[PDB]
Amino acid sequence: KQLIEFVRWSPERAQHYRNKGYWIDQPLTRILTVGVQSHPHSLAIICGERQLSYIELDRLSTNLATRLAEKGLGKGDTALVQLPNVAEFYIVFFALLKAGVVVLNALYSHRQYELNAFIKQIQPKLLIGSRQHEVFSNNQFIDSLHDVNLSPEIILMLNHQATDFGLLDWIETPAETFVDFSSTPADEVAFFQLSGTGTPKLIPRTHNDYDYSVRASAEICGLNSNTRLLCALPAPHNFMLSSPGALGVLHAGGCVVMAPNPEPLNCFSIIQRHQVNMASLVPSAVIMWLEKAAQYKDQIQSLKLLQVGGASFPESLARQVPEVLNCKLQQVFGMAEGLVNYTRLDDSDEQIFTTQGRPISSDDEIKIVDEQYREVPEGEIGMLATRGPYTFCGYYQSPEHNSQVFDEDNYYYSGDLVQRTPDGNLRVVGRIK
Ligand SMILES: O=C(c1ccccc1)c1ccc(-c2cc(C(=O)O)c3cnn(Cc4ccncc4)c3n2)cc1
Ligand SMILES: [Ca+2]
Ligand SMILES: [Ca+2]
Ligand SMILES: [Ca+2]
Ligand SMILES: [Ca+2]
CATH class of the missing domain: 3.40.50.12780 (ANL, N-terminal domain)
Incomplete structure (x- = not known):
């Protein structure tokens, strides 16, 4: 129920930064929201042959957000994401921001050793990775997490196997039911x-x-x-x-x-x-x-x-x-x-x-x-x-x-x-x- 803990600025500095107009108390999703309002169809991401407009990026990340909320992931929860340089990285990022899930983005060059340390520190209920990554080539790493009670409630995989939750599946289709969700507050942890x-x-x-x-x-x-x-x-x-x-x-x-x-x-x-x-x-x-x-x-x-x-x-x-x-x-x-x-x-x-x-x-x-x-x-x-x-x-x-x-x-x-x-x-x- 608690929001992630972190060290706050003194109230005096926080006020000063609001007074100067640095802190405007909007979620990071502001970037998408405003873009969709102004130029929905202008290109936001080019990836290989793909072209994602602002409204597409917005829709796709909303889709994934609804699916995660439907599964009960939200405020107070954390996530560990490890994806390569592909459009899905941003879709997931905006999805977790929309859902109020505090995300740690691991570098794709990180290994099971770092991932392990990250998982112990934030105990994510969500893990998103790629099957093409060495660490998720097999299930040795995933399994080893159960042996310590550090298994994420949900694991989505890019380049998934038939018996995997497919990252693209959760992105491409909204949830059956509608659970409410929103970003963590603007002066609280985003990621x-x-x-x-x-x-x-x-x-x-x-x-x-x-x-x-x-x-x-x-x-x-x-x-x-x-x-x-x-x-x-x-x-x-x-x-x-x-x-x-x-x-x-x-x-x-x-x-x-x-x-x-x-x-x-x-x-x-x-x-x-x-x-x-x-x-x-x-x-x-x-x-x-x-x-x-x-x-x-x-x-x-x-x-x-x-x-x-x-x-x-x-x-x-x-x-x-x-x-x-x-x-x-x-x-x-x-x-x-x-x-x-x-x-x-x-x-x-x-x-x-x-x-x-x-x-x-x-x-x-x-x-x-x-x-x-x-x-x-x-x-x-x-x-x-x-x-x-x-x-x-x-x-x-x-x-x-x-x-x-x-x-x-x-x-x-x-x-x-x-x-x-x-x-x-x-x-x-x-x-x-
Ligand atoms: O491309 C990578 C990378 C990182 C990990 C794995 C593979 C590639 C990469 C990208 C940036 C840096 C890197 C390293 C330093 C430094 O002082 O050591 C550094 C200092 N200023 N900058 C630019 C910078 C700008 C904003 N935030 C952080 C850094 C740096 N960027 C170092 C590595
Ligand atoms: Ca020249
Ligand atoms: Ca030039
Ligand atoms: Ca498109
Ligand atoms: Ca340093």
């Missing part, structure tokens, strides 16, 4: 994000905070109804999902275009076929694209904006993006825990090629501290500490850790080493363990 090294920690994200990061990111990256965003990174990743990600593109009324991964030749033909004009990558993938871009120039001419985040992205490599990939560059330094930094579209070249940008919000607060947690002199290198309208206040059910990474003012210490540049942007120089 779990995952930290990015020894088994991902769970980051509760509320509707308010996530929708805000999405809406504000979309504005920063100039998304609009003509945006076609390649989704070649894992769909569940905070970067690919919200920065600005698929949610940001849907917020702006554009279209997400799926790819299994960042493999250059496949991505290039997808980009060409659908005239993709935006993409998001990590440096190792940018390098793969650079190796082939000269020869396949014609195929990627439609790219207008490439976001790059993660790892290390030296200036000399960054300059190759507009030079070889023939599109604008935007650097992104963010974290599933909250804070995201973007270079702005009207930043100087120097800023874009040598910094990782600046926070989404004027109310993203940042401390850069020395070994004694004193703020360093302006411009020096220090440890990042941060808080804001979309940065979390603690990991799920982890009081000991939380106390280790938050200070008395609820600043989060990400471990990143950073310096502020004179222009105002941030440069990430390393990481502290």
Whole structure:
């Protein structure tokens, strides 16, 4: 009966964030609802040969939601979802948001070891996966869950076997009866994000905070109804999902275009076929694209904006993006825990090629501290500490850790080493363990 527990912002910060218009107290489903009202038939997702309009995405996720509610899944319940980069990922996500089921999206590259840890932490009553995944190749994993009383009441499978509950069956046809359902409240948990090294920690994200990061990111990256965003990174990743990600593109009324991964030749033909004009990558993938871009120039001419985040992205490599990939560059330094930094579209070249940008919000607060947690002199290198309208206040059910990474003012210490540049942007120089 209880809603999932999580650490709240102080009432004072929550009020401030409402006052500024960051938190508008709407569910994440807002994105679909509004899209359906404005442009029901414009494309929301392109996946292989499939094309899903906004109203289709809306109907299909409502269908699955009704089926889950009919089975008694809802508020206070959790779910574990593990799907590849396919349209069903978003249908399921919006379905669970609609039903008020708090979902953890595992990476498709996660294995039974991680899945096991996730299941023990959130005890899902719903598990959705794919038979084509190693862990669900057989029933060894599922069975082993019964041997510990951690079996989900419901298990849906993509690429299902005849004796499976077929994910597409539950999506394609509504329930026989009508049970009532609705999203969890806007300042309560919507879903779990995952930290990015020894088994991902769970980051509760509320509707308010996530929708805000999405809406504000979309504005920063100039998304609009003509945006076609390649989704070649894992769909569940905070970067690919919200920065600005698929949610940001849907917020702006554009279209997400799926790819299994960042493999250059496949991505290039997808980009060409659908005239993709935006993409998001990590440096190792940018390098793969650079190796082939000269020869396949014609195929990627439609790219207008490439976001790059993660790892290390030296200036000399960054300059190759507009030079070889023939599109604008935007650097992104963010974290599933909250804070995201973007270079702005009207930043100087120097800023874009040598910094990782600046926070989404004027109310993203940042401390850069020395070994004694004193703020360093302006411009020096220090440890990042941060808080804001979309940065979390603690990991799920982890009081000991939380106390280790938050200070008395609820600043989060990400471990990143950073310096502020004179222009105002941030440069990430390393990481502290
Ligand atoms: O494509 C993947 C991936 C992840 C797991 C399995 C397979 C692929 C992927 C995608 C993004 C990152 C990744 C890693 C870092 C980092 O500091 O280590 C990082 C820092 N900023 N960003 C951009 C970012 C933006 C928003 N939220 C979080 C991160 C990063 N993205 C790392 C990996
Ligand atoms: Ca269609
Ligand atoms: Ca171009
Ligand atoms: Ca060029
Ligand atoms: Ca970190």
